[PDB]
Every structure is written in C-alpha cells, then in structure tokens.
Amino acid sequence: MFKAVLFDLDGVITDTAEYHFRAWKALAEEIGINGVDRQFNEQLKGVSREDSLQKILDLADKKVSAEEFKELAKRKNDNYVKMIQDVSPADVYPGILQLLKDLRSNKIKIALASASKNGPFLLERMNLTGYFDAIADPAEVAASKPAPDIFIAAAHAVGVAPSESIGLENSQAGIQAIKDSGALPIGVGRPEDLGDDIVIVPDTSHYTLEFLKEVWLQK
Ligand SMILES: O=P(O)(O)O[C@@H]1O[C@H](CO)[C@@H](O)[C@H](O)[C@H]1O
Ligand code: NA
C-alpha cells in the first residue's frame, strides 16, 4: 500500500489557479503583452513566480532591466495576495476535506509539494494546516518544477520514499515532476491539457481513498 499522498495546492485543493491566471494576464497587458490567454496559461501552472514572469517576457522576446523584473514580479504578487484575502473553508474543492480525514484515519502521511510561496497562508485561510504532516519549502530546493526536487523533499519530510507515494496535480510541469520523482501521478483536469498516458479524473470529487488504493493496486 502507499504510505504518503503529496498534494499540489493551486487547482487541486482550491481554485487559486484562476486567480494566478487573472493576475498574470493583467500584468502582461500593462506592459503591452497580449498573448496570456487560457491556453498559454497552461505553461504558467505549477512553475515558480520567476519562471512564470520569464515565460511571459519571452512571448514577445521582450527585454526589461533586472530592476524592472523585480518590480513586475512584486506588482503581480501584491495583486494576487489582495485577491486571496477572503478565501475561506467554503472554497475547499469537493472531496478534498473528506480525503484528508480518511488518509489521517488510515495513518497515511500528508504533505504539500507546491512551488507557491503563498501555500502556508492559503492552508491557514482554509483551516487545513492541522491535516498536513509537512509543507515542503519551495525556496529550499535547488531546482523548481518541472524538476522532481519538491516532490522528493515532500516525501522525505514525512519519512517515506517517493516510490511509496502518490502525487496529485492539475499542471503539466507538476505531472512531469511527479514522473521524475518515482511517485505515482494522478491528475485532475482535461486529458487535452495533461495527457492520455497517466490516470486523470475530471474533478476532485473523484479523489477518494478507495479510488487511490485501486490505482495503486493496478499500477
Ligand atoms: O507567486 P507564488 O504564489 O510564489 O508562485 C505561483 O506558483 C503557482 C503554482 O506553481 C504558479 O502557477 C504562479 O504562476 C506563481 O506566481
Ligand atoms: Na484560518
């Protein structure tokens, strides 16, 4: 049986990927870059703040100073942080609270493997901190998603091998990170976005302990 579940946050625990998209699109349009639509935004899911900004600046082969890069990342983060102040337990996605309670009852470890520095604040907003055995700090890894380091760190933080873990993701970069860690990925979203080669569910209500156990058995 698996011994840990390694959760991404945005698009898995709650709909904060929507707010990252809206904030990055507003920033891009302020500097004259119009290509951040929903399709392009699939490349901005899962990756660090700095890698997200650089992908946007690439779109128009745009060159800003080092000082302006720092200011733009800060502007977008300050906006996003204002948008999430009213997030509450009512915003936890269907099935997720029940899954956390069932994993804990069965002595299965729970860890966060998010590249977002806003992860701890959001788990507090949703009254979920007490369910998590560890939060992997994204600033402590040498290489961010799609590198596997953050999933390896999350498993190690709860005393379990990546090969004895499941990872839950809504991002292209994060599915690749799980694959290269040795853990088993289960995605949530559209196969048109995330691929036809791994197990994908259409919404989070499908993330039951009973479904996870069957996927493990059949891997
Ligand atoms: O700005 P933080 O909240 O630190 O990082 C965020 O991380 C998200 C999840 O990978 C990503 O989709 C965002 O573009 C990025 O700004
Ligand atoms: Na709270």
Curated annotation (Swiss-Prot):
Q: Which family does it belong to?
A: Belongs to the HAD-like hydrolase superfamily. CbbY/CbbZ/Gph/YieH family.
The UniProt record gives the binding positions of beta-D-glucose 6-phosphate as 10, 46-47, 49, 116-118
Task: Report the top EC class in one word.
Answer: isomerase
Annotated GO molecular function terms are: beta-phosphoglucomutase activity; magnesium ion binding
Q: 4-aspartylphosphate (modified residue): where?
A: 8
One GO CC term on file: cytoplasm
Result of altering residue 45 to A: 20'000-fold decrease in catalytic efficiency
Q: Which reaction does it catalyse?
A: beta-D-glucose 1-phosphate = beta-D-glucose 6-phosphate
Instruction: Write out the PTM section of this UniProt entry.
Output: Autophosphorylated.
Provide the residue positions that the database annotates as binding Mg(2+). 8, 10, 170
Per its UniProt record, what PANTHER family does this chain match? 6-PHOSPHOGLUCONATE PHOSPHATASE (PTHR46193), HEXITOL PHOSPHATASE B (PTHR46193:SF18)
Stated induction or repression of this protein's expression: By maltose, trehalose and sucrose and repressed by glucose and lactose.
Give the protein's recorded name: Beta-phosphoglucomutase
* Assigned EC number: 5.4.2.6
Additional detail? The catalysis proceeds via a phosphoenzyme formed by reaction of an active-site nucleophile with the cofactor glucose 1,6-diphosphate (G1,6-diP). The phosphorylated mutase binds either G1P or G6P and transfers the phosphoryl group to the C(6)OH or C(1)OH, respectively.
Q: Name one GO biological process term.
A: carbohydrate metabolic process
Protein origin, superkingdom: Bacteria
InterPro entries documented for this protein:
B-phosphoglucomutase_hydrolase, Beta-PGM, Beta-PGM-like, HAD-like_sf, HAD-SF_hydro_IA, HAD_sf, PGP-like_dom2
CC cofactor note: Binds 1 magnesium ion per subunit.
Activity control summary: Activated by phosphorylation. Competitively inhibited by alpha-D-galactose-1-phosphate.
What assembly does the database describe for this protein? Monomer.
